[PDB]
Amino acid sequence: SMSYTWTGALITPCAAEESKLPINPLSNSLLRHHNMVYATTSRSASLRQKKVTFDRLQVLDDHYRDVLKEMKAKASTVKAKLLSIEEACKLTPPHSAKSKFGYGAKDVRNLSSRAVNHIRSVWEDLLEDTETPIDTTIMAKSEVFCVQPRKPARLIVFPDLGVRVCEKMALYDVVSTLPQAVMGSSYGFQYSPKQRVEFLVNTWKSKKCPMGFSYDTRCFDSTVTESDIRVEESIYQCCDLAPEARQAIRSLTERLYIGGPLTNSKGQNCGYRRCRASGVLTTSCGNTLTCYLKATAACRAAKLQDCTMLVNGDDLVVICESAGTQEDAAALRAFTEAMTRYSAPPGDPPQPEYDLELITSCSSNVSVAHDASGKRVYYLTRDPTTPLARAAWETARHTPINSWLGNIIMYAPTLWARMILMTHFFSILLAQEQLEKALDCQIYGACYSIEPLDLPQIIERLHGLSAFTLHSYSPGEINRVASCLRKLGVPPLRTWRHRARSVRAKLLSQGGRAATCGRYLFNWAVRTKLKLTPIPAASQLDLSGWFVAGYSGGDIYHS
């Protein structure tokens, strides 16, 4: 069937849309080529619509069925619990889109009478009505990028707030626990960056002659068929579930997940969806299971040897045993035709790689540096272009989520996050005297409230002390960073070192947590290094829950 059907009504914005980077003194000190940074808007919606609208092709074979049964056998060991309305409400982000039924996220979090009453009625409706399609709103997502030698806005589809809370009650525990039970070490969201690196490195070293590749499906959500979504439900149904949760899951699958009507911000009928909605609770878990299922079966069909998968939603990395240059090339090609038959055609043909550093997944790749002892240490890095463009944007404009904070945490060991992001943002926080102000950021899609002054302990707990002593980065990594800065008009690293020494000094002079930030985060900036000892507060942090599952598009808030 067609992934989408359109009436002609336009995808409209519900407020003014900014697309250009402002000329701001704070942002200009970080990035001078402001005309190269832009934000997507509804103006490009039609372009995206054209790309994601097509008829799907899907042929399932014995390998697919074999793997599905293997996954279901594992899912059968799961017992999922039903979340109370209170628990579900508390998972709702403070700035989540308000309901059209007289209440907003703040009301939900406060368990106000009207919000809770409506949520209950929505729940009872899911238990009683097993067929009526649930309405969804379609919007053009606002994301920041750097012009390329422009990307049309992505389309987000989500149901009302009441429905979103009900999804949590019925499925939060399932999407938080089932993926790991089914996919084991292949489920990527169970890993912190260091652990992801650990898995990739060990998986690579375990092969006699490793060969690996990233497989990028063209607009994955649009490739997801009704069959895929019902197969996904069949996996969830293997869990021990409360009667109402089982019905809610059955109803949500038929009324929302497999598809439904699309309404624009103006309340006009835009069309119909018959594929994955980006803004529902099951998107991350469902895409991961779907991608893992198809690729695991595809490997068998293509005869790839010892395929080890690492899946994060639609992002897939495969590491296997090489059978020779020509053999691998033909097998990868066969893999692609198998995935194509399963309705997971590639955006760009995958290419076999024989060096782990050359494998890129969602712009990220593993690289190596050295600690104080001179020992090799692998870490996760990525092209800094988008992180820098977004940092500049969030510097000049107030945004609900601070990607820069999430990037500092996830890429703390990188040359660019340390020299640029830490330097730039701490200097600004110092100047505005807002170091102790908690900010919101996202990790694997879930929203977290974080205090900048706790970054030292956070980073130590997640990356280890070596994150504050890495040096001697690879030539390729250094070159990528340097060339990126020239492209964006970002001052050279020598300038950032100078700024860091001054920022470091100021932080030390204030003592307390601030001083700790200066000592640990900016030790790289001084010749006479300071003895960095394990931070007491670090070993006392409760980061249990940060890396359990993916929740992108799931409207999740962890407090």
Ligand X SMILES: O=C(O)c1ccc(Cl)cc1NS(=O)(=O)c1cc(Cl)c(Cl)cc1Cl
418 contributes a contact to ligand X by CB under 6 A: yes
Number of Cβ within a 10 Å radius of residue 476: 12
In sequence order, which residues have a C-beta less than 8 Å from that of residue 532 and are 6 or more positions away?
465, 468, 469, 519, 520, 523
**Cβ of residue 519: shortest distance to ligand X, in angstroms?**
14
Read off φ and ψ for residue 24, nearest 5 degrees: -125, 135
**What are 79's two structure tokens?**
């017992």
> Could you tell me how many residues of this chain bind ligand X (CB under 6 A)?
22
Three-state DSSP class for 397? coil
97 binds, among ligand X, Mn ion, none (CB under 5 to 8 A by kind): none
419 contributes a contact to ligand X by CB under 6 A: yes
**Cβ of residue 377: shortest distance to Mn ion, in angstroms?**
15
Span from 80-88, 163-171, 325-333, 469-477 in contact with ligand X (CB under 6 A): 469-477
471 contributes a contact to ligand X by CB under 6 A: yes
Chain residues 334-363 in contact with ligand X, contact rule CB under 6 A:
355-357
CA dist 425 and 405 (Å) reads 9
Residue of this chain nearest to ligand X (CB atom): 524
CA dist 145 and 415 (Å) reads 21
**Cβ of residue 197: shortest distance to ligand X, in angstroms?**
8
199-204: Cβ within 8 A, 24+ apart: 199/310, 200/310, 200/317, 200/319, 200/356, 200/366, 201/356, 201/366, 201/378, 203/308, 203/310, 203/319, 204/319, 204/356
Q: Half-sphere exposure of residue 231, counting CA atoms within 13 Å on the CB side?
A: 23
Cα 391 to the center of its chain, rounded Å: 17
494 contributes a contact to ligand X by CB under 6 A: yes
Local structure of residue 76 (DSSP, 8 states):
T
CA dist 412 and 426 (Å) reads 14
Nearer to Mn ion, 263 or 284 (CB): 284
CA dist 14 and 140 (Å) reads 10
**Cβ of residue 269: shortest distance to Mn ion, in angstroms?**
29
**Cβ of residue 551: shortest distance to ligand X, in angstroms?**
28
**Cβ of residue 367: shortest distance to ligand X, in angstroms?**
5
Span from 42-50, 80-88, 199-207, 234-242 in contact with ligand X (CB under 6 A): 199-207
Nearer to ligand X, 166 or 485 (CB): 485
Instruction: Calculate the alpha carbon distances from 466 to 292, 330, 376, 489, 500 in Å.
Output: 33, 41, 10, 30, 19
379 binds, among Mn ion, ligand X, none (CB under 5 to 8 A by kind): none
Q: Is 315 annotated as a binding residue?
A: yes
CA dist 53 and 225 (Å) reads 13
**What are 387's two structure tokens?**
């992180």
313 binds, among ligand X, Mn ion, none (CB under 5 to 8 A by kind): Mn ion
Q: Helix, strand, coil % (nearest 5) of the chain?
A: 50, 15, 35
Local structure of residue 418 (DSSP, 8 states):
I
Q: Is 428 left (phi over 0), alpha (psi -120 to 50) or beta?
A: alpha
322 binds, among ligand X, Mn ion, none (CB under 5 to 8 A by kind): none
Which of 39, 248, 415, 517 is close enough to bind ligand X by CB under 6 A? 415
473 contributes a contact to ligand X by CB under 6 A: yes
366 contributes a contact to ligand X by CB under 6 A: yes
Angle, CA 190 vertex, CA 189 and CA 192 arms, to 5°: 85
Span from 162-170, 200-208, 268-276, 459-467 in contact with ligand X (CB under 6 A): 200-208
Binding site for Mn ion (CB under 5 A): 313-315, 355
315 binds, among ligand X, Mn ion, none (CB under 5 to 8 A by kind): Mn ion
CA dist 368 and 378 (Å) reads 4
493 binds, among ligand X, Mn ion, none (CB under 5 to 8 A by kind): ligand X
Which of 235, 256, 281, 368 is close enough to bind ligand X by CB under 6 A? 368
314 binds, among ligand X, Mn ion, none (CB under 5 to 8 A by kind): Mn ion
Read off φ and ψ for residue 418, nearest 5 degrees: -75, -55
Q: Which residue has the tokens 């779907």?
A: 290
Nearer to ligand X, 141 or 207 (CB): 207
Strand partners, 317: 214, 310
310 contributes a contact to ligand X by CB under 6 A: no
Nearer to ligand X, 88 or 459 (CB): 459
524 contributes a contact to ligand X by CB under 6 A: yes
Nearer to ligand X, 201 or 537 (CB): 201
Q: Is 216 annotated as a binding residue?
A: yes
Nearer to ligand X, 220 or 524 (CB): 524
Nearer to ligand X, 145 or 378 (CB): 378
What residue ranges bind ligand X (CB under 6 A)?
201, 204-205, 355-357, 366-368, 378, 415, 418-419, 470-471, 473, 478, 493-494, 497, 524-525
Residues marked as binding for Mg(2+)? 216, 314-315
